[PDB]
Design a protein around this ligand. Structure first.
Ligand SMILES: *[C@@H]1O[C@H](CO)[C@@H](O)[C@H](O)[C@H]1NC(C)=O
Lengths: 48, 48, 49
């Protein structure tokens, strides 16, 4: 966390900084998108 | 001279009042910013 | 009367490939598409100034 690392999240590969989210996903939601279909947030499959 | 000065002052007051009241007076200048922002947004959207 | 635009600079490699290193390597194969676009944008910025 708080470091640029190559992450493979549930089959999603990318590079960036992982930080605690301040946006409240609803229980059924498990993946967020920004403008232009850019992954902005995601929940941990092992800890949710 | 006095009449001309009074007319000039009244005209400047009318100009400021019209500028304050008319929010669309500066549309010609907002137009360039609107085009730039919309072009940037469209370029971003093309990634999706 | 308008007098200038917003000085915009585009990092084309990030836009096209993002964080993908292989895509960036493949993008080198296209030639000087980067250079012309960057030069045009810089010219436009100096133009506005
Ligand atoms: C994942 O599995 C491990 C090993 O069985 C277990 O200790 C852990 O509690 C599990 N986590 C969740 C969120 O189920």
């Amino acid at each position: 966390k708080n470091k640029c690392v190559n992450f493979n999240f549930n089959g999603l590969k990318g590079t960036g900084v992982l930080t605690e989210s301040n946006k409240k996903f609803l229980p059924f939601q498990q993946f967020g998108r920004d403008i232009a279909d850019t992954t902005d947030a995601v929940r941990d499959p092992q800890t949710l | 001279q006095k009449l001309i000065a009074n007319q000039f002052n009244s005209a400047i007051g009318k100009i400021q009042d019209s500028l304050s009241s008319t929010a669309s007076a500066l549309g010609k200048l907002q137009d360039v910013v609107n085009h730039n922002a919309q072009a940037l947004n469209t370029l971003v959207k093309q990634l999706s | 009367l308008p007098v200038s635009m917003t000085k915009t600079s585009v990092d084309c490699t990030m836009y096209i490939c993002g964080d993908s290193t292989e895509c960036s390597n493949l993008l080198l194969q296209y030639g000087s598409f980067c250079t012309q676009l960057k030069r045009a944008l810089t010219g436009i910025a100096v133009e506005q100034d």
